[PDB]
């Protein structure tokens, strides 16, 4: 098996492509077998780097027309003479088309390979696929693409690895009444197809040297709005004609150009293409895709209605655009060598997205949200023995399932957090200078992590920055080994101690680390609200008077959580923190109030502080009005809800949250004139939503009356929605849970007739809050019907059902019952496993999960393999955590609830 190259997952080094030409023709009507198909041809010019008698190229779900007895024709280039083909074959597991030759190709000679093929325009959201939408009574069909990571092979045969960069000459044959789009501008006007005038032919300029996973082909009846950016680049926002006319693409137009030129100037690197199209698709798997010159989006990540979309929707739009535009530099111009280093793409994009979004909306202060949405989001998983390093060894990443698995919170959020810290010990101006050199040197090339350290070292040296050692040796600690440390402070002594933080002390770390899980940590600090000097921890244990205290003094580490680590303190320092939070919490920075809450709850799970200490840190929240500290508490306590919302402990917890949030809810009731205004400050808008959501969810009668009143008022006037978009997610879900069949049906019809995906998303999620088990079962059957819920929203909707305490048993039973059938057929098996198992806290549930593993082990879990192992680790920890904390927690809530 493995002896043969066509049974191995990495391409041989024998051939290297130079240039492709591809012609594709989508058929937007089904054939007599009921299939939407595309017909195509292609020629790849490649160079023989090493003599070989076989051509191995990627091919997936493509049916080839035979020419002269074989699936390809091989021709010579500039005198070259190609050997005869013995036979061709398709190797499905490795997704190869293999051409066995009778002779050997000659080193350094060039060859050209012609192929003619057919494929399905399936609704699977991968490769060359189809998207549909209603315009009037007509169902329109769109041909569009999604190649990342390894689906370019699904639209035409190619050497489909990111380091086999090449130029591409795209031609699209399309109905005459439709527009064709690709990475580049068309090479002349669209001409009629001589064979049939009902079709036109659009040829596009040759792309730059590029990875196959960045190609894009789109055929649509879409319209657009355009604006030339201040750096010469033409921006166009494409979407369904009704959305464009209504102005739902106007906000994207307002911010796209400026962000693109901001990035160009910030990194001193021009955007080399003449245009950058943004297009929103009705059917799309991820949030967006950074195809060079033709960025594709989910409608809910690009389109925005000022009167019906919420501020959180607005943040999503500008953030994703910023994320996709950042990829133009980190990903498209400079590309990863192999998927094991994916963070070089997604880590930078997830960090740089905040700089670009902050430039576009400077009044929002979005950069602060990185602590909640990235740092603490990924620390939950990075605190497991089953996590994985930011830069995995390349030998370990081979299959498409292994590759897809790494589009996860490590590569995205941890990558963002190590860059946030990297860009903090060095200045952002020193950081951006090093990256400018990195981008210039490796333009149109591929990089590994060591390539970046070198150019950051060049900046360190030119700017006279003094570090404890090289950028290489500091950042390898955060890149080549998994996890993060917990820095324990003893203020009586001033000693610091670091160690690998694990949510469960009994977890078994099996992955070895060449650094034995010790980091070089840049430590900031404040003393009584006053920043001290920076300090570098370079060993397991150190001592410095910067962390010693006297009398009423208290210190905090990790100012504004710039560093990727958790902090624990001696008992006495904690007490003075808590005393400070009770007397005047403003003395502690807002971000560090969230740190105090989140760190203590996680420390308590790890048996490093008493759970009552973490809960005592939430007592001051009854006087807190800011968004970040409340959201940190609500997120940490969502674990308590997961563990206890099916037990006697939930009552007392709800009463505690009711007590803590009621003054804040009444404050906003006043500040908004009984909910007819919204706060001016964005963060205050989000705290209002959480106050309403928390009050209603924990039984504040005033909020329950308010949300059901607003919803009933809406049903009496369906065409005039009285609910501000910021409150719709909460009002819809709580009105559905409190109501019955009438409210569920009304929202279902509103979802079916929705003209704005932002609105459909809120309705889709609120329909899962029903308290009627029969309604939830019926809704579950809808999620797998593509005519009722788009396949792109299937798993997301199922996850909404499992979050309902009544839906938990329904979905888990459904997953156990239908996994084999499910697995075949766009569908995140990883996220669903994560969602349906996070409530598990008993030996019985662990037994079922173990049996679930055994019953499906041989078929496999694909890109959900790590998710399952992490579910097992967390379930075992949950069992121990509940036995050890149930009575303590029950008593704490009961006493502090009065």
């Amino acid at each position: 098996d493995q002896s043969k190259a066509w049974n191995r997952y990495r391409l041989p080094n024998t051939l290297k492509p130079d240039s492709y030409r591809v012609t594709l023709r989508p058929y937007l009507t089904p054939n007599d077998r009921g299939l939407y198909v595309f017909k195509g041809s292609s020629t790849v010019r490649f160079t023989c780097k090493e003599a070989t008698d076989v051509i191995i190229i990627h091919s997936k779900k493509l049916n080839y027309t035979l020419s002269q007895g074989h699936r390809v024709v091989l021709r010579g280039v500039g005198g070259s003479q190609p050997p005869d083909i013995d036979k061709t074959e398709l190797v499905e597991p490795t997704e190869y088309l293999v051409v066995h030759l009778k002779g050997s190709l000659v080193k350094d000679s060039q060859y050209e390979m012609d192929s003619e093929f057919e494929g399905e325009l399936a609704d699977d959201l991968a490769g060359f696929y189809r998207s549909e939408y209603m315009e009037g009574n007509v169902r329109k069909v769109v041909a569009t693409t999604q190649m990342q990571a390894a689906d370019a092979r699904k639209s035409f045969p190619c050497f489909d690895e990111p380091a086999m960069k090449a130029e591409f000459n795209i031609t699209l044959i399309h109905p005459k009444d439709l527009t064709a789009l690709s990475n580049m501008l068309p090479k002349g006007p669209s001409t009629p197809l001589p064979e049939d005038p009902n079709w036109n032919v659009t040829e596009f300029h040759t792309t730059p040297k590029m990875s196959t996973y960045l190609l894009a082909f789109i055929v649509s009846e879409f319209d657009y709005v355009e604006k030339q950016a201040s750096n010469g680049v033409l921006i166009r926002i494409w979407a369904r004609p009704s959305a464009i006319a209504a102005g739902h693409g106007d906000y994207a137009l307002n911010v796209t150009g400026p962000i693109l030129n901001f990035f160009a100037g910030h990194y001193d690197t021009p955007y080399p293409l003449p245009k950058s199209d943004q297009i929103g698709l009705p059917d799309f798997n991820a949030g967006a895709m950074e195809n060079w010159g033709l960025v594709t989006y989910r409608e809910n990540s690009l389109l925005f209605d000022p009167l019906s979309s919420s501020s959180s929707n607005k943040e999503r739009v500008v953030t994703v655009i910023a994320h996709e535009l950042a990829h133009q530099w980190f990903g498209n111009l400079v590309t990863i060598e192999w998927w094991n280093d994916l963070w070089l793409n997604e880590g930078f994009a997830s960090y740089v997205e905040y700089l670009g979004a902050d430039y576009a909306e400077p009044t929002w202060n979005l950069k602060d949200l990185m602590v909640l949405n990235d740092v603490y989001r990924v620390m939950a998983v990075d605190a497991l023995a089953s996590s994985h390093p930011l830069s995995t060894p390349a030998s370990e990443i081979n299959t498409p399932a292994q590759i897809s698995e790494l589009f996860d919170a490590i590569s995205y959020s941890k990558g963002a957090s190590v860059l946030r810290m990297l860009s903090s010990f060095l200045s952002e101006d020193v950081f951006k200078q090093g990256l400018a050199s990195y981008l210039h040197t490796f333009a149109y090339q591929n990089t590994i992590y060591l390539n970046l350290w070198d150019h950051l070292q060049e900046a360190v040296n030119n700017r006279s920055i003094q570090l404890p050692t090289t950028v290489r040796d500091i950042m390898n600690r955060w890149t080549l080994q998994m996890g993060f440390p917990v820095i324990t402070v003893d203020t009586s002594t001033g000693t610091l101690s670091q160690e690998h933080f694990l949510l469960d002390p009994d977890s078994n770390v099996t992955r070895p680390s060449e650094f034995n899980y010790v980091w070089i940590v840049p430590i900031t600090s404040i003393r009584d609200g006053r920043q001290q000097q920076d300090y570098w921890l370079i060993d397991v244990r150190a001592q410095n008077d910067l962390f010693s205290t006297s009398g009423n003094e208290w210190v905090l580490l990790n100012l504004n959580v710039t560093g990727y680590y958790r902090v624990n303190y001696d008992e006495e320092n904690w007490r003075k923190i808590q005393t400070q939070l009770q007397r005047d919490h403003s003395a502690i920075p807002v971000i560090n109030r969230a740190q105090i809450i989140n760190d203590a709850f996680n420390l308590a799970s790890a048996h490093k502080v008493p759970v009552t200490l973490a809960l005592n840190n939430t007592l001051f929240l009854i006087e807190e009005r800011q968004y970040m500290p409340w959201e940190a508490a609500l997120s940490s306590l969502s674990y308590f809800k997961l563990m206890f919302d099916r037990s006697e402990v939930y009552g007392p917890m709800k009463n505690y949250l009711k007590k803590q949030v009621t003054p804040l809810f009444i404050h906003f009731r006043n500040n908004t004139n009984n909910w007819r205004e919204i706060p001016e400050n964005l963060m205050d808008q989000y705290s209002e939503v959480n106050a309403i959501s928390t009050a209603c969810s924990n039984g504040v009668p005033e909020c329950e009356e308010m949300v059901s009143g607003l919803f009933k008022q809406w049903m009496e006037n369906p065409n005039n929605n009285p609910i501000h978009p910021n409150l719709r997610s909460t009002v819809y879900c709580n009105a559905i849970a409190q109501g019955g069949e009438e409210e569920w049906d009304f929202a279902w019809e509103q979802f079916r007739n929705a003209t704005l995906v932002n609105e459909a998303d809120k309705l889709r999620a609120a329909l899962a809050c029903s308290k009627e088990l029969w309604i939830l079962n019926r809704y579950l059957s809808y999620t797998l019907n593509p005519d009722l819920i788009r396949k792109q929203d299937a798993t997301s909707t199922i996850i909404s059902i499992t979050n309902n305490v009544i839906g938990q048993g329904l979905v888990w039973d459904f997953v156990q019952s239908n996994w084999k059938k499910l697995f075949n057929d766009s569908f995140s098996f990883s996220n669903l496993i994560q969602a349906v198992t996070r409530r598990f806290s008993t030996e019985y549930e662990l037994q079922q999960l173990e049996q679930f593993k055994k019953d499906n082990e041989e078929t496999g879990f694909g890109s959900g393999t790590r998710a399952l192992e992490q579910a097992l680790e967390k379930t075992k920890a949950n069992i121990k955590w509940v036995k050890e904390n149930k009575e303590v927690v029950l008593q704490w809530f009961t006493e502090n609830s009065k």
Partner: protein, 119 residues
């Protein structure tokens, strides 16, 4: 009595792939009873009434601005004799004619020129 009527119509380029916020592809600006080769349409009245007939579909609308004119089309007021034209009247005012996309682009699609004497 006499009416002074300025008609302003415009159309967007037909799909597919139409640019919704671009300058309208078709523009028809007509000042009633005006012949370019004869010159300004001047007032022959004891009293006259100005009428603006601008197109309006969805978020697109036509408008006439005040420009560098001490008055505005519609609110005109004593007169010696007032003249209107769609070509330059040296010594007069210029009222820009715009095609406006609500909350987005505005496009100048023409110019009304006015002239008057005191009296």
């Amino acid at each position: 009595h006499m009416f002074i009527v300025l008609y302003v119509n415009f159309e967007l380029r037909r799909g597919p792939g139409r640019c919704y916020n671009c300058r309208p592809a078709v523009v028809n600006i007509t000042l009633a009873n005006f012949n370019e080769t004869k010159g300004p349409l001047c007032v022959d009245t004891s009293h006259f009434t100005t009428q603006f007939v601008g197109v309006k579909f969805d978020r697109w609308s036509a408008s006439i601005n005040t420009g560098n004119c001490p008055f505005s089309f519609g609110k005109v007021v004593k007169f010696g004799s007032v003249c209107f034209s769609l070509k330059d009247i040296p010594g007069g005012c210029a009222m820009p004619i715009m095609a406006n996309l609500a909350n987005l682009n505005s496009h100048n699609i023409g110019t009304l020129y006015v002239s008057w004497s005191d009296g």
